[PDB]
Write a protein that binds this ligand. Structure first.
Ligand SMILES: O=C(O)c1ccc(-c2ccc(Cl)cc2)o1
Ligand SMILES: O=C(O)c1ccc(-c2ccc(Cl)cc2)o1
Ligand SMILES: [Cl-]
Ligand SMILES: [Cl-]
Ligand SMILES: [Cl-]
Ligand SMILES: [Cl-]
Ligand SMILES: [Cl-]
Length: 238
């Protein structure tokens, strides 16, 4: 199953993320206002994945990058060069099998720990713009081989943040989407954004029990609107 994340405009980015969320998850009854909710990922068999086609980096070019995402946990299993028809797969996702593509089993694992080392780039303070997403796209299209390089690791860190982490966290969707406007400002990932991503599992475990503020580690939600403003999609663990 294939979805597009369209970076053409702020509105195309948000609506394409919402379209994915509606297809893979179901809103929580107690955390909904209007058309906006926290949603729980629908259960799928182990190894289920979907594809994300990256589009609209230039407001029709730069259109050969595809991400493979494990559906139950939204981790990025690797990336596909659709021009060469090659799937570069992280070493901890050998259970994800994409037919019809040449699969390269990389020596590098998907963890942020590993990727930040190879990238020599910490996520706290990492900057993302339309320009650096284009640069990241070109790095991934040029990448070949079995071991991730510095430029490809930086590319993955940027793209994972604006796809998988934005799908999870409305806060990250909202702070990055500004970068797609014609003014083209730069998104800076904050320590708070990083804290969110590090707490996704427990947040996913706490929110289904929430009724009518709540706190998980360093993340504090004072009311429903703060929850909705921050979290979009949670794991199915309860
Ligand atoms: O894939 C993950 O990261 C994952 C799956 C389940 C959890 C988790 C972590 C902490 C709590 Cl308290 C509850 C669930 O995390
Ligand atoms: O892309 C965004 O910025 C976005 C889409 C929906 C929301 C939102 C914010 C707060 C509440 Cl209470 C409910 C929904 O924000
Ligand atoms: Cl929603
Ligand atoms: Cl191209
Ligand atoms: Cl690890
Ligand atoms: Cl960091
Ligand atoms: Cl604007």
């Amino acid at each position: 199953r294939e979805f597009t994340i369209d970076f053409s405009t702020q509105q195309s980015y948000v609506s394409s993320l919402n379209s994915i969320r509606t297809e893979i998850s179901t809103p929580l009854e107690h955390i909904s206002q209007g058309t906006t909710s926290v949603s729980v990922i629908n259960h799928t068999p182990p190894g289920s994945y979907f594809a994300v086609d990256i589009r609209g980096l230039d407001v029709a070019r730069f259109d050969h990058l595809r991400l493979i995402i494990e559906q139950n946990n939204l981790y990025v299993a690797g990336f596909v060069n659709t021009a060469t028809n090659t799937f570069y797969r992280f070493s901890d996702f050998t259970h994800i099998s994409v037919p019809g593509v040449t699969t390269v089993s990389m020596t590098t694992d998907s963890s942020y720990t590993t990727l930040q080392r190879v990238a020599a780039l910490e996520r706290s303070g990492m900057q993302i713009s339309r320009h650096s997403l284009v640069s990241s796209y070109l790095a991934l299209m040029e990448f070949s081989g079995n071991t991730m390089t510095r430029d490809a690791s930086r590319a993955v860190l940027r793209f994972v943040t604006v796809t998988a982490e934005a799908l999870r966290f409305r806060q990250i969707q909202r702070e990055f989407r500004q970068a797609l406007s014609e003014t083209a400002p730069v998104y800076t990932m904050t320590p708070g954004d990083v804290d969110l991503t590090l707490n996704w599992g427990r947040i996913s475990n706490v929110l289904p029990e929430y009724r009518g503020g709540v706190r998980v580690g360093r993340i504090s939600f004072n009311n429903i609107s703060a929850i909705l403003g921050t979290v979009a999609v949670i794991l199915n663990c309860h």
